[PDB]
Amino acid sequence: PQDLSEALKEATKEVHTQAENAEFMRNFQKGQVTRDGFKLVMASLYHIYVALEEEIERNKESPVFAPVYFPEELHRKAALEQDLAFWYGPRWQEVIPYTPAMQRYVKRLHEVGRTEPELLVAHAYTRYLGDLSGGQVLKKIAQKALDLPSSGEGLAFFTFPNIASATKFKQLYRSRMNSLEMTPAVRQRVIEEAKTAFLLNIQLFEELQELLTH
Numbered sequence: 739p740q741d742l743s744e745a746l747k748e749a750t751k752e753v754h755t756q757a758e759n760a761e762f763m764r765n766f767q768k769g770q771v772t773r774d775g776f777k778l779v780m781a782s783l784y785h786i787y788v789a790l791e792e793e794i795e796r797n798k799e800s801p802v803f804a805p806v807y808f809p810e811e812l813h814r815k816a817a818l819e820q821d822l823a824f825w826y827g828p829r830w831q832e833v834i835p836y837t838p839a840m841q842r843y844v845k846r847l848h849e850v851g852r853t854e855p856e857l858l859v860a861h862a863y864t865r866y867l868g869d870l871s872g873g874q875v876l877k878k879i880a881q882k883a884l885d886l887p888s889s890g891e892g893l894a895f896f897t898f899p900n901i902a903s904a905t906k907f908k909q910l911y912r913s914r915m916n917s918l919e920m921t922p923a924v925r926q927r928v929i930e931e932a933k934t935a936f937l938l939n940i941q942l943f944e945e946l947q948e949l950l951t952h
């Protein structure tokens with residue numbers, strides 16, 4: 739559907755729904771999340787965002803990504819470092835898990851950023867705007883399900899400090915993404931990569947649930 743954002747929304751409708759219906763995610767949404775479950779999602783995000791930001795930095799000047807380069811408004815690496823220090827302690831870096839599901843997500847991010855940068859937009863869009871859009875709801879759900887201590891740390895990931903209005907930001911981001919010049923072949927691959935992004939998350943949810951039970 740003409741605008742890239744709309745074509746993405748239509749093509750990923752099924753996989754997006756499946757991501758929401760995935761047991762671990764479905765449960766998180768229903769308020770059924772444990773401290774162990776929550777810590778794993780946080781470790782996962784840390785790995786994903788380290789990888790994504792590394793590739794964004796490498797391709798920030800390229801006309802195939804520049805329009806969507808918003809370093810100050812969206813970077814999450816530092817927020818996640820801050821959160822992990824609280825969830826895993828001062829030695830979090832050497833104690834956080836790094837499972838195969840997380841590894842294959844990181845792997846794809848690096849493949850894209852290194853050889854197919856024109857597809858990096860698909861991951862940035864789905865990861866950043868998805869996290870930005872549902873951050874406030876999952877934050878609250880976690881607050882009452884986790885029963886955190888009043889130490890003012892651990893949930894910075896859910897707050898984008900340099901974005902005053904999420905609604906106006908997403909509008910600017912969408913406009914910038916729709917502004918990208920793409921040949922027919924390029925576009926179809928970006929759409930396919932968007933599906934890939936949702937599928938990597940769905941596989942991650944499956945593994946996290948598996949680790950919790952077993």
Ligand SMILES: C=CC1=C(C)/C(=C/c2[nH]c(/C=C3N=C(/C=C4\NC(=O)C(C)=C4C=C)C(C)=C\3CCC(=O)O)c(CCC(=O)O)c2C)NC1=O
Nearest residue numbers: 757758779782783864865868869870872873876935936939
């Ligand atoms: C390409 C990126 C991408 C996909 C496919 C993803 C899907 C996705 N992320 C979600 C939220 C979420 N799911 C968890 C986390 C998990 N969720 C993850 O995508 C990852 C990688 C973890 C880590 C194990 C958290 C913390 C949120 C809220 C994200 C936020 O608002 O900061 C849910 C519901 C969000 C809502 O009520 O708030 C879905 C279906 N979101 C996206 O941004």
